Amino acid sequence: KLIDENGRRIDGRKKYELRPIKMEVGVLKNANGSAYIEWGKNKIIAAVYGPRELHPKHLQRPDRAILRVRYNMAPFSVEERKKPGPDRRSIEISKVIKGALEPALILEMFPRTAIDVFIEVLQADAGTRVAGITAASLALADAGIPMRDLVAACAAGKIEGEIVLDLNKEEDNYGEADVPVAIMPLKNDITLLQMDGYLTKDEFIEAVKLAIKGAKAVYQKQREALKEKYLKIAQE
Amino acid sequence: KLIDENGRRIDGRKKYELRPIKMEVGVLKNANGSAYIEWGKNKIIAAVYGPRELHPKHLQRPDRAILRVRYNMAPFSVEERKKPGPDRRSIEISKVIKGALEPALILEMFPRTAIDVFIEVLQADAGTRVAGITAASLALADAGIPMRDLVAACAAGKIEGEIVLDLNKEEDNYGEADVPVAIMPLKNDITLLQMDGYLTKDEFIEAVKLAIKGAKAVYQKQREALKEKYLKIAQE
Amino acid sequence: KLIDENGRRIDGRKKYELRPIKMEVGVLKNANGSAYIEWGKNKIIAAVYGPRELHPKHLQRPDRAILRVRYNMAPFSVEERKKPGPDRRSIEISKVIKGALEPALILEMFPRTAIDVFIEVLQADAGTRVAGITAASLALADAGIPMRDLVAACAAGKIEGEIVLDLNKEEDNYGEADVPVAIMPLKNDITLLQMDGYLTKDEFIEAVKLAIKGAKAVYQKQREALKEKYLKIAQE
Amino acid sequence: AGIMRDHIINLLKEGKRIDDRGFEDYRPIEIEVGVIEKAEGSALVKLGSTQVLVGIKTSLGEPFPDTPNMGVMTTNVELVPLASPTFEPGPPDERAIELARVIDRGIRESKALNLEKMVIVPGKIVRVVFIDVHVLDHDGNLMDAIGIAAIAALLNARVPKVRYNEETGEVETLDETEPLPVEKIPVPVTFAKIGNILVVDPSLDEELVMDGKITITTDETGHISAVQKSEGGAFKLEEVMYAVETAFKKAEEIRKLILEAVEKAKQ
Amino acid sequence: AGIMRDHIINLLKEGKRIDDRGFEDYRPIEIEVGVIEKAEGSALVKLGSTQVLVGIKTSLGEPFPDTPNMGVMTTNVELVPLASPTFEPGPPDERAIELARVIDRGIRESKALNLEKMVIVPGKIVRVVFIDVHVLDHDGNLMDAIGIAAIAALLNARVPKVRYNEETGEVETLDETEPLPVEKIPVPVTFAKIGNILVVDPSLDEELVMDGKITITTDETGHISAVQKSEGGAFKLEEVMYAVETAFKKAEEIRKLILEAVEKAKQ
Amino acid sequence: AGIMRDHIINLLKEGKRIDDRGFEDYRPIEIEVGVIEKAEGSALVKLGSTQVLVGIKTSLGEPFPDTPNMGVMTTNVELVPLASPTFEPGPPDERAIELARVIDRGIRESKALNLEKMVIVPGKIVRVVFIDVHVLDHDGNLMDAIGIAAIAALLNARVPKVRYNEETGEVETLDETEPLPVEKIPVPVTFAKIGNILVVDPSLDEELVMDGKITITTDETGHISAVQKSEGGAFKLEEVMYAVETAFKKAEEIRKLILEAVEKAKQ
C-alpha cells in the first residue's frame, strides 16, 4: 500500500521513469577528477586521484595501475544518522563499484600506480551505488584517465509485483527486489549486476533489461556532462 | 558435586585417563603443513606456513626464522558463541603456544623468514591449548620443518581435591587447578607450563608430572600420526 | 559558590598564586630524557626518545627531525577511571603540546629522525597539558637536545567573574574559562595558547598575561631543575 | 602463475578445464552436517579442496526495534589466515564481507530461515541465529562452498524449544530441541568468466585467471534470492541469462546433496 | 613547494599575498544552508576553494548522567580522503579531532546552542544534536570553513516538535518543526603567522608555508568562546591582541553572510 | 647486545651476574603505596630500575550474570611507550596481555581479593575493582614488579563504605572508607633460565640473553596461585621444582617489604 497507483508511483512517476538526474563534472580542486550527481534525492560526489604513486610500494602491480574505490555515506545522508566510518554495506558497495569501474579502465597504461576513487553520498534515497558509479565514471573521464567506455549504472526493481525502473528509498525499502546494473553501454558489457530480493528468472531478466535501458539514458546524460565540460574548456 | 565418583569421572573415565584422541596429519591443501586433532570434544586444526618471505621486511631476524602463532576459536566452538576476533585469552594462549613450539624448531635454518602457525579451535572442551600445540607440532613436522623433537602437550588438573589428568570443560570450569604442560619428550624439556587455580607445591609438582605422563602418551599418538603419513607417501 | 573567598581560593591560595610545584629531571633509565612534575595534585612524567631512527622510513623529513608527542592519562589519574587508550581530548592535547615544543627545538639539527615525547599524567587536577609541556621541556633538555629556550606553561582562568592563575580541577570544572599558555620566556614567544570558556577581549588578554607571569615563574623552577641536575653531574 | 592464465584460456578453447571438469561441472562435493556437535547446527562443505565449516549458534535476544515481529539472523564469514596465504588476520576484509552479505541475502531474501517463526515474545524476545562461517581451505568458489554449508547447517540446526510461560512471564529454554523454520534451500551457483566462456565452480587456479564472476542464488521454488557479479570483468546480458538458468540446474543438483547430507545426520 | 615558501614570504614583505588578498581579507565566501534536505539542518560553506558541508541530524536520547538538565551536542569532522591527498581513510586523525573540538567549544562555550532548551523530560529524554562536518575540498582554513558551516547549519536547523504527553508519559514527535535554540553565532577567525605577519584565512599554499596559526572564535556579544593556537610557531602577546581584535571584525562580516544565507533559505 | 649474551653466560659460569647479584637475589626493591592519592589505592614498585605504578580505582557496577555473588576485578597492564623503546602505542600487545592475565590469576585464584565480600546487592550491585598497571620504566622482571605493585596497591586500597539502605533501596556511598577484602598476598617470583642456570629477577640485560622464564606466584599459605613459563626455552621438571621452592622463599621476603610499605602508608 501503495508504491504503484494509478499507474503512477509515489512521486508521481510512471514505472519506466527516471528521477530528475543532474550531473556536473570537475567540482573539486584537489581531486584529479570530480563529478557531482543529483539523482532524485541522492546527492553524491565522486573524486579521483590520480594515477598516483602507490603506497605501500608492495601493493604495486608491475604491469598496471590498481583501482581502489571507497564508497562512504555522510552521517547526515540517511534518515537515521549513520555513525561515521566503514560498514559491511559500504565495504561491499565499494568492492562492487570497483569491479564496475575496473573493466572500463585501461589499467596497464599506468603501471605501479593506484587510481583512487572516492564516492561520497551526501544524501541518499536509494540508488547511491549506481548514481555513484555514474559519477565515478565522469570523475574518471574528468581525471583524463583513458577509458574504454563510461560505465553507466541504474537500478531496476520490483514493487507491487511490478517491475519498475530506478527505485526511491520507499520503493527499495518496501519493494520486492533491487536490481542495480552498471554497464559500459557501447559494447553492452555489464560490469555490475546485483539482485537483492526475490524474483523469478523472467522478472530478474526483465529488471536487468529495464535497468540497462535506464543506464543507457544515464549514459547520454554522462556524455552530455562531458560535452558540457569539453565546451567550458573551449575558452578562449 | 561430583566431578569424581566412584572413582570414575563425569564421562566415566578414571583419573589418569585420557579422552579419545584422534590425529590426522596433512588435512589442508593451502597450508605447508596441517594436522587435525580430535581430543575428546575438542576439534582443532593446525596449519603451518612456510618458512616464508617475512613481511614486513623489518621483522626479519638476520640469523633465523621467527615463529608466529595464532590461536583462535571459531564462534561456534564454545557453548556461548564467541564473537569473532582476538581476545586476551587467545592472545596469551598464542604467546604461550609459540613459546612451546619455539624451542623445538631449528630456527637458524631459515634466516629472514617466518614460520606461521595457526591453531583453529573448531570445538573446545578444555585442553585446546595443549591439543593445539600437539597438532601444531604435527603440522610443523608435516611442513617438513626440522625439529629437535615433537612438542607434546596435555593438561593435568585438580578436581575434588584430587589430581586428575586431562580436564574436560566441566572439570576445568568447576575444578581447582588447570595445569597444561608441553614438553619435548625425548629430552624431557618442558616448553609450556601453566597453572591456573590453587595448589600446594606437592599438588602442583604431581599435576606437572601427571600431565607429562599424559603428554608422553600423546606423543606416541603423534609419532603414530607421522608414521601413518610416512606410510601413505610410501606410494607406489 | 564559592571558588573565590575571601579573597582566598578553595585550597586557600590567593588568586595569583601557584599550587606547590615540584620538578625533578632524569627520573627514567630508558628514556633519553625524563622529568617528573608534581604541580598541585598533578603528577606527570615526561620522557623523550631520542633523536632516533624514524620509522617508517617515509615519515622522515630530509632536512630535520620530526617532533612526536603523546599525552596520555593513566586510568587512575582522574576521579572517574579513564578507560585506557587515546581519546579526542588527549589527541588534541598531544597536538597542542607538540605545537608548543616544536618551536623551541632546533629540528634541522637531526634530519631524518623523530624526537618522541611522551607525557604521562599519573594524577590530574587541571593544568596537566601545561604541567606536561613544562616537564616535556625539562625532559628535552635532559635528553641533551638543543633548544632555543625552555618552553614553560601555566594556565590562567576565570572563576566567579575573577581572573585567577593556575586552576585546580574544581576551578577548571566549575569556572568560566581555562586559558593555558606556553611560552618560551626568553623571547616571550607564545607557543601554546588556548581558551576554553567565555571571556571578553580584556578578560582574555588579562588571563593570557597572568598565565604568562605564571609560566615565567614555572620557568625559574625549570632552570632550577636543570641547575640541580647540572650540579649532580658535577661528580666527582 | 600468469603463465597459468595462458594454459587455462588455451585449454578452455578446447572445451577443457585443467582438471577435466566440463564447464558446467562442480568439483566433487562433500557435505557433512552436525560435525560441530556443540553448535546448534553445522556443516562441513568441501567443493573439491575448498573447505568451509559453518556453525549455527542460536541464542535469545531482543529483535531490532524496526522488526519486533522477526527473529535475528546474522552471517559472518571468517577467512581464517590458515585457509589461504591470501587470508590475513583481522576484521573481515571486503572478500569476507561480500561473501557474508551475499550468502545472507540469499537466505534472508528467500525467507529460507523464516524469521517470523522465530519470535517468542513479540518485540521483546526472539531467536537470534548466528551463521558463522569458518573458511578452512580456500581453493576456489568460496561463495558456493559457504552458501551450501550455511543452508545445510541451518537445515541441520536443532535449537532448544523455548516457551513463554504466559503465567510468570518467564521464558523457559527446554531440553527438547526443534528445527529452525527453514523453509527453502537457497544454493548459490557461481560462474567465472574466462575470456568468453563461463565455467561453473571456478577453482583457485581459475579464479586467478578469470575476468569476472557471477553468482546466482536460487531456491526450489524457481526463485532467485541473490545475484552478485563480483570482481571485475563484464558479462553480456545473455551470459547472465545462461548463468541464471544453469545456476537453477546446478542448484537442484546440489540441493539434493544438501538434503541427503541433512537426512544422513539424523541416522 | 618550499620554493613556494620563499615566494610567499617575499610577497608578504610587499604587502601582497599570492591571490592579491589583503592580510585581513577572506577569500570569496559562499554559504548555502539547507542543501541536505533530509538533514535537520545543513550548510555548504566555501572559503575560496575550501568546501565544507555540515549536517545537523537530531534525535532524542538520554542526557549524560552528569547533566540531566541539558540536551546533547556532538561535533565530528570527517576529513574525507576525497577532500585532500593528505586526508587518509580512518578514525579522525588529530587534525580532524582538533578541528571538531575547537568548533564545538566555540559553539558550546558561547551557549550558542542552548542545550538547556533541548530538554524534553529532565534526566531522561533530551534533544541530541549531531554536527557532522563533511570536509569536501581542503584548500586552507578549514577551521573557519567548518565553524561557519557548523553555526550556519545550526541556524538552519529545523527539528521536529516534541511534546511530552504528560498524561501517558509518551513522547510525541510531531510533523511541525521548530528551530534549534541557537542564541549566538560564534565564528572562528583564523590567522596564519608567516614570518612576522599574520594573514587572515590562510589558503592551503599559505598553510604550507606558515609558522603557526591562531583561531579566535567570537560571537555578536563581544565575547570569545574559543582560542586555539594550532600547529607550531610562536605568537607575541600583541599578535594575539591584534588577532583577537581583527577576529572580532572579521566575525561580524562573516556573521552577516551567515545570517543572510540562513534567511535566504526560508525564502 | 648479543656480544652481551656471551658475557652474561660466561659470568654465569663463575657464579656471577653482571651486577654482582647472587642467582637468588632480587635487585633493590622499593615499594611505595598510596602515591596516587586520588586513587583508591596505589603502589609504586621499583625492582632495581624497573618501575611500575599500579592504581586501584573502584566503582559500583553489576556483577557478571554468571556470578551475582562476587564483585568484579579487572587487571590491565599498560606498557606505556615511555617505559621502553620496545613499548609501542596501542591496545595491549601480548606482553601486556600475558602480564595482566598472569597477575590477575595470581590474585584471583588465591582469592587474594575476596570478590564474595564485594557484593552490595547480590546479582545487581557489586564493587568493581580496576587494577591498572602503569609500567613506567622497563628494566626487567616486569611480572614481579607488577604483581608486587598490584597486591601492594590492593592492600593499600581504601574504598568508600557502601550501604544498601534496605528501606529506600538506595545505595549510599559514604565518606568513611574501608579496606578491600584482601586476604592473601600473592607475589610472583620469576626466574630467567640462561643456559642451565635459573636466576631470580632477571634484569633487562638478562632477559635479552635468557632462554626462557618461569614465574611462580605463591601466597603466605604455602599455595601457588599461578605458574607461567613465558617466552621460549624449556625447563626440566626439577628446575620447576627448584623454582617453585625458591619462589616461595623469595615471596616471603618480598611479602614483608609489601606489608612494611602498606603499614608505613597509614603512618
Ligand SMILES: Nc1ccn([C@@H]2O[C@H](COP(=O)(O)OP(=O)(O)O)[C@@H](O)[C@H]2O)c(=O)n1
Ligand atoms: N544504512 C543505510 C542503508 C541504506 N539506506 C537507504 O536505503 C537505500 C537503498 O540501500 P541499498 O543497500 O539498496 O543501496 P543503494 O540502493 O543506495 O545503492 C539507500 O540509498 C539509503 O537511502 C539507509 O538510509 N541507510
Ligand SMILES: Nc1ccn([C@@H]2O[C@H](COP(=O)(O)OP(=O)(O)O)[C@@H](O)[C@H]2O)c(=O)n1
Ligand atoms: N571464552 C572461553 C574460554 C574458555 N572456554 C572453555 O573452557 C575451556 C578451558 O579454558 P582454558 O582457558 O583453561 O583453555 P584450554 O583449557 O582450552 O587450553 C576451553 O576449552 C573452553 O571449552 C570457553 O568456552 N569459552
Ligand SMILES: Nc1ccn([C@@H]2O[C@H](COP(=O)(O)OP(=O)(O)O)[C@@H](O)[C@H]2O)c(=O)n1
Ligand atoms: N577525562 C577527563 C578530562 C578532564 N579531567 C579533569 O579536568 C582537568 C582539566 O581538563 P582540561 O581539558 O582543562 O585539561 P588540563 O587542564 O589538565 O590541561 C583535568 O586535569 C582533569 O583533572 C578529568 O578528570 N577527566
